[PDB]
Amino acid sequence: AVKKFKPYTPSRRFMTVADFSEITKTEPEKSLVKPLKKTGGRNNQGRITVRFRGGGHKRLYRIIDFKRWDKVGIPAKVAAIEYDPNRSARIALLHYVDGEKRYIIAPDGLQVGQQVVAGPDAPIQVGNALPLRFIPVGTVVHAVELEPKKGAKLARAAGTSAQIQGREGDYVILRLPSGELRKVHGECYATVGAVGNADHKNIVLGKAGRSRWLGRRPHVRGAAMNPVDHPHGGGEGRAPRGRPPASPWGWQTKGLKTRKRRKPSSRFIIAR
Amino acid sequence: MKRTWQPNRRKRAKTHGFRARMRTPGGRKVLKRRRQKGRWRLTPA
RNA sequence: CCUACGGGCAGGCGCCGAGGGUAGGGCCCGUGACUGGGGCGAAGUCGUAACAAGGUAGCUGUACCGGAAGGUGCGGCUG
RNA sequence: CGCGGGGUGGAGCAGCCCGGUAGCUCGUCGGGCUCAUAACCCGAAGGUCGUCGGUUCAAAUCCGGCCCCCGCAACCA
RNA sequence: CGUGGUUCGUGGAGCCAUGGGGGAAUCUGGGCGGACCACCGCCUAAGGCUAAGUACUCCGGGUGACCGAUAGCGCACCAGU
RNA sequence: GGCGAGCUAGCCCUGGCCAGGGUGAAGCUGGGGUGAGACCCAGUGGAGGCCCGAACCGGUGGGGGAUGCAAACCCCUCGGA
RNA sequence: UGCGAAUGCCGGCAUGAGUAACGAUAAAGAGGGUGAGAAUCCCUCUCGCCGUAAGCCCAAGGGUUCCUACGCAAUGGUCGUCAGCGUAGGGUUAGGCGGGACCUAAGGUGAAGCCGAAAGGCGUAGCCGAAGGGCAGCCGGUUAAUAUUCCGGCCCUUCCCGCAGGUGCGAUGGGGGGACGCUCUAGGCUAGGGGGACCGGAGCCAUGGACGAGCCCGGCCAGAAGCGCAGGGUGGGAGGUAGGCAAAUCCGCCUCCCAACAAGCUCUGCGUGGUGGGGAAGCCCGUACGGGUGACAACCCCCCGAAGCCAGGGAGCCAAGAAAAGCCUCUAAGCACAACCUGCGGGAACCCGUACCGCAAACCGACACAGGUGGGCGGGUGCAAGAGCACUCAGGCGCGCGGGAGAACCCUCGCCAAGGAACUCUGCAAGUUGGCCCCGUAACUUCGGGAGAAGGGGUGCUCCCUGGGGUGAUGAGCCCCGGGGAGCCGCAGUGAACAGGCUCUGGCGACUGUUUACCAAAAACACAGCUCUCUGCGAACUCGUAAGAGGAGGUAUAGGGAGCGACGCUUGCCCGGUGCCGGAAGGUCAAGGGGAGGGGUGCAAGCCCCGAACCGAAGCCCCGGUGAACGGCGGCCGUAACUAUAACGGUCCUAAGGUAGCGAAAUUCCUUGUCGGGUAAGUUCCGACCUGCACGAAAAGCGUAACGACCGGAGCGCUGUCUCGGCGAGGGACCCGGUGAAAUUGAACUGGCCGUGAAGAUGCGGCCUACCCGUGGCAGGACGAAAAGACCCCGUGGAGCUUUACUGC
RNA sequence: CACCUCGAUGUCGGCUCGUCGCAUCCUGGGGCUGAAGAAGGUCCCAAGGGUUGGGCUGUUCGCCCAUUAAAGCGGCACGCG
Ligand SMILES: [Mg+2]
Ligand SMILES: [Mg+2]
Ligand SMILES: [Mg+2]
Ligand SMILES: [Mg+2]
Ligand SMILES: [Mg+2]
Ligand SMILES: [Mg+2]
Ligand SMILES: [Mg+2]
Ligand SMILES: [Mg+2]
Ligand SMILES: [Mg+2]
Ligand SMILES: [Mg+2]
Ligand SMILES: [Mg+2]
Ligand SMILES: [Mg+2]
Ligand SMILES: [Mg+2]
Ligand SMILES: [Mg+2]
Ligand SMILES: [Mg+2]
Ligand SMILES: [Mg+2]
Ligand SMILES: [Mg+2]
Ligand SMILES: [Mg+2]
Ligand SMILES: [Mg+2]
Ligand SMILES: [Mg+2]
Ligand SMILES: [Mg+2]
Ligand SMILES: [Mg+2]
Ligand SMILES: [Mg+2]
Ligand SMILES: [Mg+2]
Ligand SMILES: [Mg+2]
Ligand SMILES: [Mg+2]
Ligand SMILES: [Mg+2]
Ligand SMILES: [Mg+2]
Ligand SMILES: [Mg+2]
Ligand SMILES: [Mg+2]
Ligand SMILES: [Mg+2]
Ligand SMILES: [Mg+2]
Ligand SMILES: [Mg+2]
Ligand SMILES: [Mg+2]
Ligand SMILES: [Mg+2]
Ligand SMILES: [Mg+2]
Ligand SMILES: [Mg+2]
Ligand SMILES: [Mg+2]
Ligand SMILES: [Mg+2]
Ligand SMILES: [Mg+2]
Ligand SMILES: [Mg+2]
Ligand SMILES: [Mg+2]
Ligand SMILES: [Mg+2]
Ligand SMILES: [Mg+2]
Ligand SMILES: [Mg+2]
Ligand SMILES: [Mg+2]
Ligand SMILES: [Mg+2]
Ligand SMILES: [Mg+2]
Ligand SMILES: [Mg+2]
Ligand SMILES: [Mg+2]
Ligand SMILES: [Mg+2]
Ligand SMILES: [Mg+2]
Ligand SMILES: [Mg+2]
Ligand SMILES: [Mg+2]
Ligand SMILES: [Mg+2]
Ligand SMILES: [Mg+2]
Ligand SMILES: [Mg+2]
Ligand SMILES: [Mg+2]
Ligand SMILES: [Mg+2]
Ligand SMILES: [Mg+2]
Ligand SMILES: [Mg+2]
Ligand SMILES: [Mg+2]
Ligand SMILES: [Mg+2]
Ligand SMILES: [Mg+2]
Ligand SMILES: [Mg+2]
Ligand SMILES: [Mg+2]
Ligand SMILES: [Mg+2]
Ligand SMILES: [Mg+2]
Ligand SMILES: [Mg+2]
Ligand SMILES: [Mg+2]
Ligand SMILES: [Mg+2]
Ligand SMILES: [Mg+2]
Ligand SMILES: [Mg+2]
Ligand SMILES: [Mg+2]
Ligand SMILES: [Mg+2]
Ligand SMILES: [Mg+2]
Ligand SMILES: [Mg+2]
Ligand SMILES: [Mg+2]
Ligand SMILES: [Mg+2]
Ligand SMILES: [Mg+2]
Ligand SMILES: [Mg+2]
Ligand SMILES: [Mg+2]
Ligand SMILES: [Mg+2]
Ligand SMILES: [Mg+2]
Ligand SMILES: [Mg+2]
Ligand SMILES: [Mg+2]
Ligand SMILES: [Mg+2]
Ligand SMILES: [Mg+2]
Ligand SMILES: [Mg+2]
Ligand SMILES: [Mg+2]
Ligand SMILES: [Mg+2]
Ligand SMILES: [Mg+2]
Ligand SMILES: [Mg+2]
Ligand SMILES: [Mg+2]
Ligand SMILES: [Mg+2]
Ligand SMILES: [Mg+2]
Ligand SMILES: [Mg+2]
Ligand SMILES: [Mg+2]
Ligand SMILES: [Mg+2]
Ligand SMILES: [Mg+2]
Ligand SMILES: [Mg+2]
Ligand SMILES: [Mg+2]
Ligand SMILES: [Mg+2]
Ligand SMILES: [Mg+2]
Ligand SMILES: [Mg+2]
Ligand SMILES: [Mg+2]
Ligand SMILES: [Mg+2]
Ligand SMILES: [Mg+2]
Ligand SMILES: [Mg+2]
Ligand SMILES: [Mg+2]
Ligand SMILES: [Mg+2]
Ligand SMILES: [Mg+2]
Ligand SMILES: [Mg+2]
Ligand SMILES: [Mg+2]
Ligand SMILES: [Mg+2]
Ligand SMILES: [Mg+2]
Ligand SMILES: [Mg+2]
Ligand SMILES: [Mg+2]
Ligand SMILES: [Mg+2]
Ligand SMILES: [Mg+2]
Ligand SMILES: [Mg+2]
Ligand SMILES: [Mg+2]
Ligand SMILES: [Mg+2]
Ligand SMILES: [Mg+2]
Ligand SMILES: [Mg+2]
Ligand SMILES: [Mg+2]
Ligand SMILES: [Mg+2]
Ligand SMILES: [Mg+2]
Ligand SMILES: [Mg+2]
Ligand SMILES: [Mg+2]
Ligand SMILES: [Mg+2]
Ligand SMILES: [Mg+2]
Ligand SMILES: [Mg+2]
Ligand SMILES: [Mg+2]
Ligand SMILES: [Mg+2]
Ligand SMILES: [Mg+2]
Ligand SMILES: [Mg+2]
Ligand SMILES: [Mg+2]
Ligand SMILES: [Mg+2]
Ligand SMILES: [Mg+2]
Ligand SMILES: [Mg+2]
Ligand SMILES: [Mg+2]
Ligand SMILES: [Mg+2]
Ligand SMILES: [Mg+2]
Ligand SMILES: [Mg+2]
Ligand SMILES: [Mg+2]
Ligand SMILES: [Mg+2]
Ligand SMILES: [Mg+2]
Ligand SMILES: [Mg+2]
Ligand SMILES: [Mg+2]
Ligand SMILES: [Mg+2]
Ligand SMILES: [Mg+2]
Ligand SMILES: [Mg+2]
Ligand SMILES: [Mg+2]
Ligand SMILES: [Mg+2]
Ligand SMILES: [Mg+2]
Ligand SMILES: [Mg+2]
Ligand SMILES: [Mg+2]
Ligand SMILES: [Mg+2]
Ligand SMILES: [Mg+2]
Ligand SMILES: [Mg+2]
Ligand SMILES: [Mg+2]
Ligand SMILES: [Mg+2]
Ligand SMILES: [Mg+2]
Ligand SMILES: [Mg+2]
Ligand SMILES: [Mg+2]
Ligand SMILES: [Mg+2]
Ligand SMILES: [Mg+2]
Ligand SMILES: [Mg+2]
Ligand SMILES: [Mg+2]
Ligand SMILES: [Mg+2]
Ligand SMILES: [Mg+2]
Ligand SMILES: [Mg+2]
Ligand SMILES: [Mg+2]
Ligand SMILES: [Mg+2]
Ligand SMILES: [Mg+2]
Ligand SMILES: [Mg+2]
Ligand SMILES: [Mg+2]
Ligand SMILES: [Mg+2]
Ligand SMILES: [Mg+2]
Ligand SMILES: [Mg+2]
Ligand SMILES: [Mg+2]
Ligand SMILES: [Mg+2]
Ligand SMILES: [Mg+2]
Ligand SMILES: [Mg+2]
Ligand SMILES: [Mg+2]
Ligand SMILES: [Mg+2]
Ligand SMILES: [Mg+2]
Ligand SMILES: [Mg+2]
Ligand SMILES: [Mg+2]
Ligand SMILES: [Mg+2]
Ligand SMILES: [Mg+2]
Ligand SMILES: [Mg+2]
Ligand SMILES: [Mg+2]
Ligand SMILES: [Mg+2]
Ligand SMILES: [Mg+2]
Ligand SMILES: [Mg+2]
Ligand SMILES: [Mg+2]
Ligand SMILES: [Mg+2]
Ligand SMILES: [Mg+2]
Ligand SMILES: [Mg+2]
Ligand SMILES: [Mg+2]
Ligand SMILES: [Mg+2]
Ligand SMILES: [Mg+2]
Ligand SMILES: [Mg+2]
Ligand SMILES: [Mg+2]
Ligand SMILES: [Mg+2]
Ligand SMILES: [Mg+2]
Ligand SMILES: [Mg+2]
Ligand SMILES: [Mg+2]
Ligand SMILES: [Mg+2]
Ligand SMILES: [Mg+2]
Ligand SMILES: [Mg+2]
Ligand SMILES: [Mg+2]
Ligand SMILES: [Mg+2]
Ligand SMILES: [Mg+2]
Ligand SMILES: [Mg+2]
Ligand SMILES: [Mg+2]
Ligand SMILES: [Mg+2]
Ligand SMILES: [Mg+2]
Ligand SMILES: [Mg+2]
Ligand SMILES: [Mg+2]
Ligand SMILES: [Mg+2]
Ligand SMILES: [Mg+2]
Ligand SMILES: [Mg+2]
Ligand SMILES: [Mg+2]
Ligand SMILES: [Mg+2]
Ligand SMILES: [Mg+2]
Ligand SMILES: [Mg+2]
Ligand SMILES: [Mg+2]
Ligand SMILES: [Mg+2]
Ligand SMILES: [Mg+2]
Ligand SMILES: [Mg+2]
Ligand SMILES: [Mg+2]
Ligand SMILES: [Mg+2]
Ligand SMILES: [Mg+2]
Ligand SMILES: [Mg+2]
Ligand SMILES: [Mg+2]
Ligand SMILES: [Mg+2]
Ligand SMILES: [Mg+2]
Ligand SMILES: [Mg+2]
Ligand SMILES: [Mg+2]
Ligand SMILES: [Mg+2]
Ligand SMILES: [Mg+2]
Ligand SMILES: [Mg+2]
Ligand SMILES: [Mg+2]
Ligand SMILES: [Mg+2]
Ligand SMILES: [Mg+2]
């Protein structure tokens, strides 16, 4: 769980790489069920609209299955576990008895060989998807839907998961990775287990280059600019903020809440 | 050292050519203007 | 050069070689602006920590804090 | 030389604006409690208000001059 | 209610237009005469067309107290070269 | 109101390039070690914004040039590779 | 309608001036020829320079520059008979090369559809889009000039028709395949190269020797099928089937049974192959280039050997590495006297490019410009290797002014006695060092480093003996790593060329990286990493009027914003003010509601206008919280049994009065503080003290190994830096022939002193000095040139930037 | 102070090259002395010539080391880009 290196170069001294033992025989990444070509692109129609992106290794997309109700009843065999560059979590290749193949975001524990399945039926065991209402209160789940039939959206990042805290009406109360207490419709599919590859949070990029491989170009502080182009640029030399800390566009960036208040979603939430 | 002019037949046509001029409303005016002035060449050769 | 000459001596070269030189290490001693605590010194300053529930039982390993003794936390010992 | 502030019992601070009244803590002195000291309690004394002028009926107070005190300023060069 | 137009810059601010809200009547119905009311008058909104008198000069011609090759059009000449 | 990313900056798609030498990570195999281990040793192995240095990319110090060979150049030197 | 001025405008001609220059210091010399004319054109001979080029081949760009004849006014930095120049004529040949009647990539365009005052913006399919995918030509000959294009030889593709043989044929649809990274790398080949005592070949014996296993030259290229050698790809059969938006017999999944190997099948590379073709030196021809002979040329062995080929080869690794068509399979309509598949035969096969330059005199730089320009080839020997360095092959060049001379001075070089940093802001500069092998190597450390630490020894040639490996048969030969021994020569053996000076000690930044294109490369930016904060997903945020899009085909181990900046030990107190966060109360508050009451006009019903109470958001007030939020973090006085100092005390104020650590510092004013160290001497440097004008904890505090073309201090080494200069070399300067600029310029017949003058006089006064005109030199003056001062002020001139300035959006 | 110069009179220090003044640092000649001698003190004459090398700092200056007959002051656009 996490590789170290001997300091045979600086930066290698602190550099740390993911363990890839979980990766069942793998390298080629299963054409057909994905990949699709993924359009590396750092702007919209012309203009940069997210700073400091671009470059970094080319990458093939894996079209994964964020709606398991797609094949209720039909069981599948876990054929493989493989590396997916487009996400922190790792993916499992599912061989359905239909002869259909699909990638699922691999949960912790999921071993190659297991049968897996989705539906109101379905044995509450890691890898299986069900509508939320039919899941035992207190069970930890992942890849949750937020509205019935709209595909999984919550708890998918490596290591994450939601907890089921109780039910009330057509909804059940989830505790999301953020710590928020959310009502979600009971018909929304989730899948038992936590996400897995939870040592992800413990890698140390080690050097600037590494950030670059991940498509992350250097980020420059407002402090290092001029008044023309940031609320923090100017002085002679070093200089405190001399105002409440701001973003390039003028807004405050320390505590100033930003969620739209009158959002209809408001009456389905209750936490941090 | 490397100067500013770096000739490239395709770029030139793609940028100043007749067809490119006819797409933009602004371009169509460049033609209108040159045609009215009596230019012998409405577009780079 | 000498013969008692298929030799000896002078003389030449080589080895090692006292030591001198260049360079880098190791141990010990002396000394140094300044700095750390320590001991000792008839009658200096500040408090009162301990000895009698020592007037907050005490001591204790650790940790933080405070002019100072010390105080507090955690656990321990009863002396 | 500039600008602002300040000088009041032995110490440190009020009162100066809005003229007529000098007030606070500490200290000092006398007496209590103690075997004694300190703490504590009861009493008390002590200042012309930096200085020299002027205004006023009257000046710590309002005005001007000198003397010090604190702080800021002294940039293009 | 919010604006534009008119000489009208919110003014006593009508008139004409209209983005928003409300929302009629058919001659005894409606609009206007500078807030508003009365009176007295003018005129018939929410469909459309309509010559001529008017503007201009790429073009043709006629004229000049207009230029005469550094002038006159940038070009009298193969110049928008 | 238009013209410009054929210079320059960033990004996107598709190709190309980096003489030669050095250092010798993990892993692996073996031996030792232990109750089992950690671990040690040898070989093997060939990692790295690792080392030296051409191409290539630079532009550090000095000299020259200054109506220049040059509206940024030349020589020596130097950085990355 | 009158010009002398406007750093006026257009034009012409002057001055500087026969002056600077004539564009890389790779270099020239003679003979012959041509011609009106020759250093400059042609030819020969000699000399020099490039050779990972300064040679050759592509791609861009250029667009007649190409070959030939005639020619020299201009262009050519001189000349010109010459030319890339003037005139004319000629020259570019493709089913197989490149591109198009193929494919898709970013992106572009865009039926449907969405949005926008108009213009127009978006957008699924589709279409366009290439140096990527797909796709059939190799060798040689020929022209003044084109050639994989013409030709010769051998070989191949598609399309149409027909014949035969085979099969359910049939697509834009289903499936497979195409199909993919980086580093390292095996086997076998090829290109390429070396050697040969072997094969072929004109000749050669000089100058002392050599007729010799001598010298010199050459010893190949292409090639179907078949055949070998080496590799790539691939399991076969059966049953079940609900998945691959219809249907599949195909693919997927399951079961069973046979191979598990490349066996077989298939594809590629290389060898061989019918035949075809090339074929040196030297000599002879005339060139302006080529042509004859050599020739019935020979045409073979050995060795080195790729980064290229077999190719979709193998291993490892993480950052996880296009698409679509061709192709194959599957079935659907449909058709199955169709159709498709195989073989053979006959016919058919279009458009564009093709000259020449292409690291450059033909491209980008106003120039025949010392700059810039992407891909491939790039031989030999030596040097550890190499594309490095020296010389050299093929090939190509001497750079389009020359001849002299031998000053100063300048540039680029070489050497220097004694000294050796005394130079200077500084060892700036230069020198020293320098490759390989061996011995050897400290503090400290994050255990990797520091290390090429430092400091040393070896280094050539000759003979003798000897180990191991590759290729061959184990063998010889050839090639490759060595080892031991005895000797030879010089001042010197990496004998030339390419090739670190070293150490000690501070500051800043952890580090590799990034930057002010053209005065700053840094202690600035970035960086892994730490913290705060926002964001539940139609996320926040960003772009846009919108649609839409980025975020992300991501989902809190994620994304945005901010500060800090590896790592180590740490990061204190203040929430009074400002920000942000929380607070269903209360205060205030707009439109609106509400209307108590009032007013205008009517005879009146009425019409019309004001208008209190009270009910009405956010915001603000108010109550709280919050420090890796903006920020802030005290004054006077006294006191100890020498003195001094003050652990202690009094009092005033605050939201709280600066903790650790550090400190004359990238911070210290006084200041060269004081003391110690270094030095003969130290305003700097190092250590320390603390009186911190005016350090102090994520605008982080204090340290830290390694790292640095950063900045400081010291020493050793070595020196022309210096005492202090000297000599020498070459390119200029100078003279002669050719060509011939420039800024500047009121006109000039343009001297010194002491005065005077708008206060610094060639130009005025007095006196002094002084025949007329040049050339080489120096730079004191002409308030010398250049630029309508950038500093300063002024203008109710401008512009970028800020904020609790104003007012808006 | 603001008179020439803002359609430009380049600014400290060093280097180089000097030239001039004398109110003389040394050497020469003097008077006086509280001048025994030697050595000084002070004033007068005198500008011919001479007036060192180093450490520190950008420094001028100054401090210091080692010498010296002496380690002189000033002007020349604080002489001289
Ligand atoms: Mg666009
Ligand atoms: Mg992390
Ligand atoms: Mg940053
Ligand atoms: Mg900046
Ligand atoms: Mg901008
Ligand atoms: Mg701003
Ligand atoms: Mg700021
Ligand atoms: Mg600052
Ligand atoms: Mg370049
Ligand atoms: Mg051009
Ligand atoms: Mg140009
Ligand atoms: Mg092109
Ligand atoms: Mg139109
Ligand atoms: Mg025409
Ligand atoms: Mg020793
Ligand atoms: Mg001591
Ligand atoms: Mg002591
Ligand atoms: Mg006690
Ligand atoms: Mg106690
Ligand atoms: Mg007690
Ligand atoms: Mg006790
Ligand atoms: Mg304790
Ligand atoms: Mg303490
Ligand atoms: Mg205290
Ligand atoms: Mg306890
Ligand atoms: Mg007092
Ligand atoms: Mg009063
Ligand atoms: Mg009292
Ligand atoms: Mg008393
Ligand atoms: Mg007074
Ligand atoms: Mg008085
Ligand atoms: Mg200023
Ligand atoms: Mg109006
Ligand atoms: Mg008004
Ligand atoms: Mg108006
Ligand atoms: Mg009316
Ligand atoms: Mg309306
Ligand atoms: Mg009516
Ligand atoms: Mg009317
Ligand atoms: Mg009317
Ligand atoms: Mg009508
Ligand atoms: Mg009408
Ligand atoms: Mg009409
Ligand atoms: Mg008219
Ligand atoms: Mg006309
Ligand atoms: Mg006339
Ligand atoms: Mg004319
Ligand atoms: Mg004219
Ligand atoms: Mg005329
Ligand atoms: Mg006209
Ligand atoms: Mg004209
Ligand atoms: Mg014409
Ligand atoms: Mg560009
Ligand atoms: Mg290359
Ligand atoms: Mg590579
Ligand atoms: Mg290597
Ligand atoms: Mg073992
Ligand atoms: Mg090894
Ligand atoms: Mg190993
Ligand atoms: Mg090895
Ligand atoms: Mg490297
Ligand atoms: Mg390096
Ligand atoms: Mg280096
Ligand atoms: Mg290097
Ligand atoms: Mg340079
Ligand atoms: Mg620079
Ligand atoms: Mg220079
Ligand atoms: Mg220079
Ligand atoms: Mg180098
Ligand atoms: Mg280099
Ligand atoms: Mg005139
Ligand atoms: Mg005049
Ligand atoms: Mg002259
Ligand atoms: Mg001359
Ligand atoms: Mg000349
Ligand atoms: Mg020459
Ligand atoms: Mg020639
Ligand atoms: Mg010739
Ligand atoms: Mg072309
Ligand atoms: Mg021509
Ligand atoms: Mg020609
Ligand atoms: Mg001719
Ligand atoms: Mg001519
Ligand atoms: Mg000529
Ligand atoms: Mg020329
Ligand atoms: Mg002739
Ligand atoms: Mg011609
Ligand atoms: Mg070709
Ligand atoms: Mg083609
Ligand atoms: Mg056709
Ligand atoms: Mg096409
Ligand atoms: Mg297409
Ligand atoms: Mg439209
Ligand atoms: Mg569009
Ligand atoms: Mg599109
Ligand atoms: Mg291609
Ligand atoms: Mg391919
Ligand atoms: Mg082709
Ligand atoms: Mg040929
Ligand atoms: Mg040719
Ligand atoms: Mg042919
Ligand atoms: Mg048939
Ligand atoms: Mg059928
Ligand atoms: Mg397909
Ligand atoms: Mg190989
Ligand atoms: Mg060959
Ligand atoms: Mg060969
Ligand atoms: Mg022979
Ligand atoms: Mg013969
Ligand atoms: Mg002879
Ligand atoms: Mg013979
Ligand atoms: Mg031979
Ligand atoms: Mg041979
Ligand atoms: Mg060959
Ligand atoms: Mg062959
Ligand atoms: Mg099978
Ligand atoms: Mg099947
Ligand atoms: Mg189906
Ligand atoms: Mg089959
Ligand atoms: Mg095989
Ligand atoms: Mg072959
Ligand atoms: Mg064959
Ligand atoms: Mg033959
Ligand atoms: Mg033949
Ligand atoms: Mg021949
Ligand atoms: Mg000819
Ligand atoms: Mg492979
Ligand atoms: Mg298609
Ligand atoms: Mg079929
Ligand atoms: Mg045929
Ligand atoms: Mg051609
Ligand atoms: Mg050609
Ligand atoms: Mg060529
Ligand atoms: Mg070049
Ligand atoms: Mg080049
Ligand atoms: Mg090239
Ligand atoms: Mg060439
Ligand atoms: Mg040429
Ligand atoms: Mg030339
Ligand atoms: Mg050139
Ligand atoms: Mg050119
Ligand atoms: Mg260059
Ligand atoms: Mg080669
Ligand atoms: Mg070579
Ligand atoms: Mg040799
Ligand atoms: Mg070498
Ligand atoms: Mg070379
Ligand atoms: Mg040659
Ligand atoms: Mg020549
Ligand atoms: Mg030349
Ligand atoms: Mg030499
Ligand atoms: Mg010397
Ligand atoms: Mg010597
Ligand atoms: Mg020495
Ligand atoms: Mg000196
Ligand atoms: Mg010195
Ligand atoms: Mg310096
Ligand atoms: Mg230094
Ligand atoms: Mg140097
Ligand atoms: Mg030498
Ligand atoms: Mg050197
Ligand atoms: Mg060693
Ligand atoms: Mg080491
Ligand atoms: Mg060190
Ligand atoms: Mg060494
Ligand atoms: Mg050595
Ligand atoms: Mg020798
Ligand atoms: Mg062998
Ligand atoms: Mg071999
Ligand atoms: Mg052998
Ligand atoms: Mg030997
Ligand atoms: Mg020797
Ligand atoms: Mg070196
Ligand atoms: Mg320090
Ligand atoms: Mg750095
Ligand atoms: Mg760069
Ligand atoms: Mg750069
Ligand atoms: Mg720059
Ligand atoms: Mg600039
Ligand atoms: Mg989106
Ligand atoms: Mg997306
Ligand atoms: Mg964040
Ligand atoms: Mg920073
Ligand atoms: Mg820092
Ligand atoms: Mg703090
Ligand atoms: Mg406190
Ligand atoms: Mg606060
Ligand atoms: Mg608060
Ligand atoms: Mg607050
Ligand atoms: Mg609030
Ligand atoms: Mg309220
Ligand atoms: Mg109201
Ligand atoms: Mg109302
Ligand atoms: Mg009424
Ligand atoms: Mg209210
Ligand atoms: Mg407030
Ligand atoms: Mg309360
Ligand atoms: Mg005392
Ligand atoms: Mg005593
Ligand atoms: Mg006493
Ligand atoms: Mg105290
Ligand atoms: Mg402080
Ligand atoms: Mg402190
Ligand atoms: Mg300390
Ligand atoms: Mg100091
Ligand atoms: Mg400071
Ligand atoms: Mg000393
Ligand atoms: Mg000292
Ligand atoms: Mg300094
Ligand atoms: Mg001060
Ligand atoms: Mg600071
Ligand atoms: Mg601070
Ligand atoms: Mg802070
Ligand atoms: Mg520090
Ligand atoms: Mg660096
Ligand atoms: Mg540096
Ligand atoms: Mg020194
Ligand atoms: Mg010299
Ligand atoms: Mg010479
Ligand atoms: Mg001449
Ligand atoms: Mg004269
Ligand atoms: Mg005068
Ligand atoms: Mg006169
Ligand atoms: Mg005169
Ligand atoms: Mg004369
Ligand atoms: Mg002269
Ligand atoms: Mg002069
Ligand atoms: Mg001169
Ligand atoms: Mg001037
Ligand atoms: Mg001016
Ligand atoms: Mg203004
Ligand atoms: Mg004046
Ligand atoms: Mg005046
Ligand atoms: Mg002037
Ligand atoms: Mg005198
Ligand atoms: Mg005197
Ligand atoms: Mg005397
Ligand atoms: Mg005397
Ligand atoms: Mg005497
Ligand atoms: Mg110095
Ligand atoms: Mg002096
Ligand atoms: Mg001084
Ligand atoms: Mg002087
Ligand atoms: Mg002065
Ligand atoms: Mg002076
Ligand atoms: Mg001066
Ligand atoms: Mg200068
Ligand atoms: Mg100067």
PDB file of N, CA and C (backbone and C1' of nucleotides) in Angstrom, chain G residues 78-80:
ATOM      1  P     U G  78      31.393  47.424 -57.995  1.00  0.00           P
ATOM      2  O5'   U G  78      32.971  47.531 -57.814  1.00  0.00           O
ATOM      3  C5'   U G  78      33.617  48.795 -57.818  1.00  0.00           C
ATOM      4  C4'   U G  78      35.020  48.678 -58.339  1.00  0.00           C
ATOM      5  C3'   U G  78      35.148  48.157 -59.763  1.00  0.00           C
ATOM      6  O3'   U G  78      35.007  49.184 -60.726  1.00  0.00           O
ATOM      7  C1'   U G  78      36.639  46.986 -58.339  1.00  0.00           C
ATOM      8  P     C G  79      34.080  48.965 -62.008  1.00  0.00           P
ATOM      9  O5'   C G  79      34.948  47.959 -62.885  1.00  0.00           O
ATOM     10  C5'   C G  79      36.312  48.230 -63.166  1.00  0.00           C
ATOM     11  C4'   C G  79      37.000  47.038 -63.781  1.00  0.00           C
ATOM     12  C3'   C G  79      36.204  46.278 -64.833  1.00  0.00           C
ATOM     13  O3'   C G  79      36.293  46.881 -66.110  1.00  0.00           O
ATOM     14  C1'   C G  79      37.203  44.753 -63.304  1.00  0.00           C
ATOM     15  P     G G  80      34.982  47.084 -67.016  1.00  0.00           P
ATOM     16  O5'   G G  80      34.777  45.647 -67.657  1.00  0.00           O
ATOM     17  C5'   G G  80      35.890  44.846 -68.012  1.00  0.00           C
ATOM     18  C4'   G G  80      35.480  43.416 -68.194  1.00  0.00           C
ATOM     19  C3'   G G  80      34.055  43.211 -68.677  1.00  0.00           C
ATOM     20  O3'   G G  80      33.943  43.324 -70.088  1.00  0.00           O
ATOM     21  C1'   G G  80      34.434  41.869 -66.777  1.00  0.00           C
TER      22        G G  80
END
